[PDB]
Structure prediction request, 482 residues.
Amino acid sequence: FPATV
Amino acid sequence: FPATV
Amino acid sequence: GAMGSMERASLIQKAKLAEQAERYEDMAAFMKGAVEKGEELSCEERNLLSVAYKNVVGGQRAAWRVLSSIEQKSNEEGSEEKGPEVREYREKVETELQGVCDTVLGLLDSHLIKEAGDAESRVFYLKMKGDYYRYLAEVATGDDKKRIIDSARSAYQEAMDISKKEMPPTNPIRLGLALNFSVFHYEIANSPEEAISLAKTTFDEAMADLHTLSEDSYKDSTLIMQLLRDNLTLWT
Amino acid sequence: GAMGSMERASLIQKAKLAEQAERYEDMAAFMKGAVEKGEELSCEERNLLSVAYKNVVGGQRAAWRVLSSIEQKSNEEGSEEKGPEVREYREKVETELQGVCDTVLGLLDSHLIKEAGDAESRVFYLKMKGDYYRYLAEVATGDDKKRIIDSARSAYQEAMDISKKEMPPTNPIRLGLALNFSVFHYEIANSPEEAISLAKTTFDEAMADLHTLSEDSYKDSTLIMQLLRDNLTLWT
Ligand SMILES: *CC(=O)NCCCC1CCN(C(=O)C2(Nc3ccc(Cl)cc3)CCOCC2)CC1
Ligand SMILES: *CC(=O)NCCCC1CCN(C(=O)C2(Nc3ccc(Cl)cc3)CCOCC2)CC1
Ligand SMILES: [Mg+2]
Ligand SMILES: [Mg+2]
Ligand SMILES: [Mg+2]
Ligand SMILES: [Mg+2]
Ligand SMILES: [Mg+2]
Ligand SMILES: [Mg+2]
Prediction:
């Protein structure tokens, strides 16, 4: 999964 | 802490 | 609410303890209680709220993905019929996830967003609105899926418009919003070129502004820039 | 019980799904439901029950230790008074932990232990009884602490007596019981020499019996023997 904050 | 199972 | 009898300051203190103990459900419940006192949140308190719910919903999303994969495998040719249990349990987890998202969206709508006038606060809350509609969209399969996706888009877009007018390109809230909206484009909206373009332009504009920053601000901004770079590497 | 309407087999299926999703609270609730059907458990089902509650209570113990350490620091000389919140939240976590322990002990008493006639099952359940009284003892500070410690001791001792008569020295249940009873001696009963002696004798007697085992049984036994060795290294 891609990075999110 | 010591090992327990 | 079960937290109605506890002082606001005590709820915030206990949220911080819960975080130290990695008790994120408790942390989220304390922060919900604090929001429901009706006073605006400080910067630190916004961070606590977001960390708590990110961790709770993050765990639910990971579990939902495990169960959804098992369910998908069950529906392939040659898979033995095992009854309704996998679907039921995936639905149980899904319903709990949706409940958490609805709880967060409810706090934002009653009444965090409407009282947020400073750009940092308004952008942060609108980003959260986009995020929790995005999590709803991840699990949506019905009549409302388009409207849920559009709700996420609209919240992210309003945040983006404010962020570009009111905040420098290195601001961590501006950067985090762009990171997440780019992921929305890639994973939810079926717009990978838009996702890549947004991540790249955000990175490049931040790079050009780093010269203005203290060492500490540089550290904060560059950490999120690296996340943008990590996604770009995954996508190209 | 909320699980009263679900088939036993479905509860077991869902416990296995919950384990795959690392949803240990759900796993424990499913297994409680399965026990409450009233039928004896299989070996695999005993493993599921134990894994579920070990993981739930393990997380609670870790959180309790974080909070207890903060509380202890608050009570040192020179520490600023911060009010009742740390104690309150430690008590909240403690009460939830005690509730889980009481739930497990209740399943064992109504009616798992009394229907367990095979040595493996009886030893396994009595070990669990010792374990959950040990977790109660970890947090006990009052009039009943001695009786809680003795309840743990008595359960472990009955298990030990059966295990030595009925099982080979390499049996994983016998080994795990000895490992945990040795930790009881060291951490709860203030008997470190007894803890060391038990771990050493258990290890040595198992070593002498490995020659009887298949490759697969050897792997199982030696894993737990290494845990005994790890504790001995910590303690000497
Ligand atoms: C003043 C105000 O409203 N502050 C709210 C909290 C903002 C901070 C900014 C710094 N920060 C981070 O850099 C990390 N997390 C997030 C960044 C940006 C957003 Cl919009 C959300 C979270 C810290 C954790 O690692 C990722 C970056 C924390 C939140
Ligand atoms: C037939 C029967 O009643 N079986 C109950 C489950 C016993 C198994 C034995 C193998 N095993 C392990 O070796 C590990 N965990 C435990 C060992 C011993 C006990 Cl008493 C409890 C747990 C597996 C995980 O790593 C540690 C050893 C699983 C339980
Ligand atoms: Mg007040
Ligand atoms: Mg559904
Ligand atoms: Mg644009
Ligand atoms: Mg039936
Ligand atoms: Mg107490
Ligand atoms: Mg002896």
